[PDB]
Amino acid sequence: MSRLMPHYSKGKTAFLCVDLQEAFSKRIENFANCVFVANRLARLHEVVPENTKYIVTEHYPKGLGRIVPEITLPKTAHLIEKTRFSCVVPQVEELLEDVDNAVVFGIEGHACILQTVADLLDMNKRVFLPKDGLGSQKKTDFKAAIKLMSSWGPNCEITTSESILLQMTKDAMDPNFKRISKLLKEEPPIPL
Amino acid sequence: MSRLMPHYSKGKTAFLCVDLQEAFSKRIENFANCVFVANRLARLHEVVPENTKYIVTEHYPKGLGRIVPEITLPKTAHLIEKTRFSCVVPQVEELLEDVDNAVVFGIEGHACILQTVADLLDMNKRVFLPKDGLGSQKKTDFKAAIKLMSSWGPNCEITTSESILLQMTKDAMDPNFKRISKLLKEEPPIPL
Amino acid sequence: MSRLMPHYSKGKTAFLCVDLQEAFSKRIENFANCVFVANRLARLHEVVPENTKYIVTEHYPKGLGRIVPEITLPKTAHLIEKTRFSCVVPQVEELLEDVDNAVVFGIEGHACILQTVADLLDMNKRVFLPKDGLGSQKKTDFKAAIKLMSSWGPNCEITTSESILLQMTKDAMDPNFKRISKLLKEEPPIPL
Amino acid sequence: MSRLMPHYSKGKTAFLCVDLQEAFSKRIENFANCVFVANRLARLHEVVPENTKYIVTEHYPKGLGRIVPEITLPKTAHLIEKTRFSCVVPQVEELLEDVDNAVVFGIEGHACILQTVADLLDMNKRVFLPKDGLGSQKKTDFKAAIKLMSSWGPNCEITTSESILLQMTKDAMDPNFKRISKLLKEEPPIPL
């Protein structure tokens, strides 16, 4: 019945960076905020790496798209490729064999993101989504997938990246706070 | 506890094209997007016919309305007529005796659509609705029926037609993808 | 697990017309649509009286407010008065001893309406609310009470008065349809 | 299965005034409405003190912020300080050992407020939140935390301060009504 992200040191969390590729960069209004959140969670995972993996999927890469350069991946990143609309492919499954929580971000809300989270839920992981770092080409598709997923509690939760950073460091006197606090002073390309 | 549309080859799905008739064509702002979605799912069913039926109801046809010509029905279509506000009439019931999923689209959200889905739910079918291809004459009636139905999970889900096509072909290397992909490159009369 | 209003002839339904009085007439933007819906359900109940009661509460009447004249009450109306914020007072309780469904409409969404429906739910009645015929002085109070109540399913449902008339006459060949249809051709003071 | 605030004399209620400090005063658009609600519940608790405690947390006070002067605290107030993002610290826990309901208000919706309510829920208290007296620096963070929490029923409820005052005095002939009514005639800085 647990209700938000637990302290970062309880279990493991995968950051899952979904399909942020070149074909899309122009097609989605808040693509840049998605990039920002991808960077934010990237730097966060470097703060706390014995507790968090970071995962990049690229979808049919060569046929329109490699993972936009403005995302500076961590050296530890598990970069993987697929044609499945959902991120849950053989590679990522085993890479989640010991992971309790998935923080899922990227494009598109109603397509890969949506299928990815239903699969995660079926795997019994808790899923957490910064709305912050989600997008679709069209509003109607996005807005509908977002409401569907909001009805998928208690194991699915939509908040934002600032909410999520704060949920993992439950205290401002946390050994990692000064580092994490610094991320939070960065401002998005498109104002929230 | 299943969470989205399953792969098209698991079970059967009825496309249910509800009351898109002449009296209404002018009375509903997004009537044309409803037509677009009706065509979209029509062409889709022709892609995958051993797995999907297609059903058109016309409500009190002669007294104001036959099914708008700009919808090019599949040859396989089960076209039926009624006065019941809900589509669940004797004819359609038996035509669902072996169907697991219903994709319901048309007019009006708060009237025939709304009654139709509560009946489907009572029949234990999973219902999937492209918000895309729904409408009412007035916002207030639509918006309210849509929220009611969003609270009818897990067996009712409101997304859109692009979300739904992608949910049925779970992979971009699917034998049917190139065909289905082509539908998705078509753009609606009224931008989403 | 029933999902909408049943056919008018299955059980009994109270129409509950809540606090539409003079003090308020000016204080609420859609007061007039509330009046319209009050009239609509009034005429409806006259169509089907062996199955529906009609109930008017006036709240502290003499100290600012009798029930606005532009509502033409049915002769059968059970007009009652109180100081309780909720409509569930001794008089109305016994007047619901054999009633299965309550259609609740009036003012204010977050105050009398809100308390009234929580009490009804505690009495095991199904409650149905035309958003149509609800209002508050301020948006913020209304909008919040409306969302709370939307989360009170399966025995609470918010739709509109056209949705509700159609749900009770499940067929356009219903002996009462022509009469009920005629109500639906009336247009509200403030467009929906 | 209880559905709103019970009459003020059934059990105990803590008013919890969360982080309304100087650093924030300018950073949040509706900060002043939060102050208004803080005052409103302050005066209310003085009306009914054998049944309600009032609690102010200040978060890292000296390092940017003491509790804004325009809030005139009750003499009975339990003013406490912390670095935990959530209000549930050792001091407040024991101060809730005999409290059934918490009315939670302040800043920020997605941060301290959000963590505070998940902890309260874990403690089996009913939580009630006047949306009225909540805020965040950015819309996106607020709006998302608000929806998450709306899905946390039956023991969490978001309404407003007028709804909440009325829910605790279930009758306009209540010995405390004239006093409480007077609070309700006060108007917020930023119109609801």
User: Cβ–Cβ contacts within 10 Å for residue A92, how many?
Assistant: 24
Q: For residue D114, which residues of chain A lie inside 8 Å, CB to CB?
A: 4, 159, 163, 167
Q: Is D71 on the interface with A (CB under 8 A)?
A: no
Of A77, A191, A169, B38, the C-alpha closest to D137 is A191
Q: Please judge whether A110 and B163 are an interchain contact, meaning their C-beta atoms are less than 8 angstroms apart.
A: yes
Please say whether the beta carbons of B184 and A85 come within 8 A.
no
Q: Is C124 on the interface with D (CB under 8 A)?
A: no
Q: For residue B171, which residues of chain A lie inside 8 Å, CB to CB?
A: 83-85
Write b or e for each residue in C76-94: b if 16 or more Cβ atoms lie within 10 A of its Cβ, otherwise e: ebbeeebebbbbbbebbee
Residue of D nearest to A147 (CA): D147
Q: Is C141 on the interface with D (CB under 8 A)?
A: yes
Counting CB pairs under 8 A, whether chains C and D reach 3 or more, is yes
Question: Cα separation of D36 and A8, whole Å?
Answer: 36
The single-letter DSSP state of residue C100 is -
Q: Is C145 on the interface with D (CB under 8 A)?
A: yes
User: Cβ–Cβ contacts within 10 Å for residue C64, how many?
Assistant: 11
Nearest C-alpha of chain D: how many angstroms from C27?
A: 13
Q: Find the length of chain C.
A: 192
Elucidation method: X-ray
Which residues constitute the domain of residue B138?
Answer: 1-192
Nearest C-alpha of chain D: how many angstroms from A129?
A: 10
Of A150, A169, A171, the CB nearest to D151: A150
Question: Cα separation of A95 and D159, whole Å?
Answer: 43
Nearest C-alpha of chain D: how many angstroms from C100?
A: 20
Q: Which of A27, A123, A140, A151 to mutate to test the interface with B (most CBs of B within 10 A)?
A: A140
Report the relative pairing of strands D126-130 and D156-159 from DSSP bridges.
Answer: parallel
Counting CB pairs under 8 A, whether chains A and D reach 3 or more, is yes
Q: Is A147 on the interface with B (CB under 8 A)?
A: yes
The single-letter DSSP state of residue D53 is E
Q: At C168, list the tokens.
A: 């009770």
Residue ranges in chain D assigned as alpha helix (H):
31-47, 90-94, 112-122, 139-150, 161-168, 177-183
Q: Please judge whether B121 and C3 are an interchain contact, meaning their C-beta atoms are less than 8 angstroms apart.
A: yes
Q: Is A89 on the interface with B (CB under 8 A)?
A: no
Residue C183 CB contacts under 8 Å (≥ 6 apart), including other chains:
C40, C43, C44, C165
Question: Cα separation of B85 and D104, whole Å?
Answer: 46
User: Cβ–Cβ contacts within 10 Å for residue D24, how many?
Assistant: 20
Question: Cα separation of A112 and A57, whole Å?
Answer: 10
- Helical (H) or strand (E) element with B151: none
Q: Is B155 on the interface with C (CB under 8 A)?
A: no
Question: Cα separation of B58 and C184, whole Å?
Answer: 21
Of A36, A57, A49, A56, the C-alpha closest to A162 is A36
Please say whether the beta carbons of A12 and A98 come within 8 A.
yes
Nearest C-alpha of chain A: how many angstroms from B84?
A: 29
Using alpha carbons, list the distances in angstroms from residue B180 to B3, B69, B133, B190, C98: 22, 23, 18, 21, 55
Q: Please judge whether A163 and D151 are an interchain contact, meaning their C-beta atoms are less than 8 angstroms apart.
A: no
Of B44, B66, B43, B46, the C-alpha closest to B56 is B66
Q: For residue C59, which residues of chain D lie inside 8 Å, CB to CB?
A: 172
Please say whether the beta carbons of A125 and A99 come within 8 A.
yes
Residue of B nearest to A59 (CA): B172
Write b or e for each residue in D25-41: b if 16 or more Cβ atoms lie within 10 A of its Cβ, otherwise e: beebebbbbbbbbbbbb
Counting CB pairs under 8 A, whether chains D and B reach 3 or more, is no
Please say whether the beta carbons of A133 and A71 come within 8 A.
no
Of C162, C163, C171, the CB nearest to B83: C171
Q: For residue C4, which residues of chain B lie inside 8 Å, CB to CB?
A: 114-115, 118
Please say whether the beta carbons of C76 and C41 come within 8 A.
no
In degrees, to the nearest 5, what angle opens at C-alpha C119 toward C-alphas C43 and C59? Answer: 60
Of D175, D163, D167, the C-alpha closest to D37 is D163
- Backbone angle region of D99, left / alpha / beta, with phi > 0 → left and psi within -120 to 50 → alpha: beta
Residue ranges in chain B assigned as alpha helix (H):
31-47, 90-94, 112-122, 139-150, 161-168, 177-183
Q: Is C159 on the interface with B (CB under 8 A)?
A: yes
Q: For residue B145, which residues of chain C lie inside 8 Å, CB to CB?
A: 159-160, 163
Q: Please judge whether D171 and C85 are an interchain contact, meaning their C-beta atoms are less than 8 angstroms apart.
A: yes
Q: For residue D60, which residues of chain A lie inside 8 Å, CB to CB?
A: 172
Amino acid type, C60: Y
Q: At B36, list the tokens.
A: 């677009």
User: Cβ–Cβ contacts within 10 Å for residue D151, how many?
Assistant: 16
Q: Using CA of residue B59, residue B61, residue B63, residue B69, what is the dihedral sign?
A: positive
Q: For residue A129, which residues of chain D lie inside 8 Å, CB to CB?
A: none
Question: Cα separation of D37 and D20, whole Å?
Answer: 11
Q: At A115, list the tokens.
A: 């299928």
Q: Please judge whether B166 and A86 are an interchain contact, meaning their C-beta atoms are less than 8 angstroms apart.
A: no
Of A59, A86, A114, the CB nearest to B163: A114
In chain B, the number of structural domains is 1
Say what angle helices A139-150 and B161-168 make with each other, to 10 degrees: 70
Residue B110 CB contacts under 8 Å (≥ 6 apart), including other chains:
B136, B141, B142, B144, B145, C159, C160, C162, C163, C166
- Helical (H) or strand (E) element with C115: helix C112-122
Please say whether the beta carbons of C44 and C183 come within 8 A.
yes
Q: What is the CATH number of the domain that holds C150?
A: 3.40.50.850
Question: Cα separation of D165 and D91, whole Å?
Answer: 27
Nearest C-alpha of chain C: how many angstroms from B189?
A: 24
Residue A66 CB contacts under 8 Å (≥ 6 apart), including other chains:
A21, A22, A58
Of B11, B9, B15, the C-alpha closest to B161 is B15
Using alpha carbons, list the distances in angstroms from residue A13 to A16, A115, A192, C103, D148: 9, 19, 25, 48, 20
Q: Please judge whether B110 and C160 are an interchain contact, meaning their C-beta atoms are less than 8 angstroms apart.
A: yes
Q: For residue D87, which residues of chain A lie inside 8 Å, CB to CB?
A: none
Q: Please judge whether C171 and B85 are an interchain contact, meaning their C-beta atoms are less than 8 angstroms apart.
A: yes
Q: Is B28 on the interface with C (CB under 8 A)?
A: no
Q: For residue A122, which residues of chain B lie inside 8 Å, CB to CB?
A: 1, 3
Amino acid type, C185: K
Of A139, A104, A173, A151, the C-alpha closest to A28 is A139
Nearest C-alpha of chain B: how many angstroms from C37?
A: 13
Q: Find the length of chain D.
A: 192
Write b or e for each residue in C24-62: b if 16 or more Cβ atoms lie within 10 A of its Cβ, otherwise e: bbeebebbbbbbbbbbbbbebbebbeeebbbbbbbbebe
Say what angle helices C112-122 and C139-150 make with each other, to 10 degrees: 10
Q: At A170, list the tokens.
A: 């439950």
Helices (runs of H) and strands (runs of E) counted in chain D: 6, 7
Using alpha carbons, list the distances in angstroms from residue C38 to C28, C34, C110, C122: 15, 6, 19, 25
Question: Cα separation of D104 and C119, whole Å?
Answer: 24
Question: Cα separation of A65 and A47, whole Å?
Answer: 29
User: Cβ–Cβ contacts within 10 Å for residue B111, how many?
Assistant: 23
3-state SS track over chain A: CCCCCCCCCCCCEEEEEECCCCCCCCCCCCHHHHHHHHHHHHHHHHHCCCCEEEEEEEECCCCCCCCCCCCCCCCCCEEEEECECCCCCHHHHHCCCCCCEEEEEEECCCCHHHHHHHHHHHCCCEEEEEHHHEECCCHHHHHHHHHHHHCCCCCEEEECHHHHHHHHCCECCCCCHHHHHHHCCCCCCCCC
Q: Please judge whether C114 and D159 are an interchain contact, meaning their C-beta atoms are less than 8 angstroms apart.
A: yes
Please say whether the beta carbons of A115 and A121 come within 8 A.
no
Write b or e for each residue in A101-140: b if 16 or more Cβ atoms lie within 10 A of its Cβ, otherwise e: bbbbbbbbbbbbbbbbbbbbbeeebbbbbbbbbbbbbbeb
Q: Using CA of residue C59, residue C61, residue C62, residue C68, what is the dihedral sign?
A: positive
Q: Is D59 on the interface with A (CB under 8 A)?
A: yes
Q: Is the bond preceding A49 in cis, omega lying within 30 degrees of 0? A: no
Q: For residue C87, which residues of chain D lie inside 8 Å, CB to CB?
A: none
Question: Cα separation of C135 and B73, whole Å?
Answer: 44
Q: Which of residues 161-180 of A touch D (CB under 8 A)?
A: 162-163, 166-167, 169-173
Q: Could you tell me what percentage of chain C is helix, strand and coil, using 3-state DSSP and rounding each to the nearest 5?
A: 35, 20, 45
Q: At C43, list the tokens.
A: 């005429």
Question: Cα separation of B53 and B96, whole Å?
Answer: 9
Q: Is C144 on the interface with D (CB under 8 A)?
A: yes
The single-letter DSSP state of residue B133 is G
Residue C132 CB contacts under 8 Å (≥ 6 apart), including other chains:
B140, C33, C37, C105, C160, C161, C162, C188, C192
Q: At which residue do the structure tokens 């009630």 appear? A: D128
Q: Please judge whether C172 and B111 are an interchain contact, meaning their C-beta atoms are less than 8 angstroms apart.
A: no
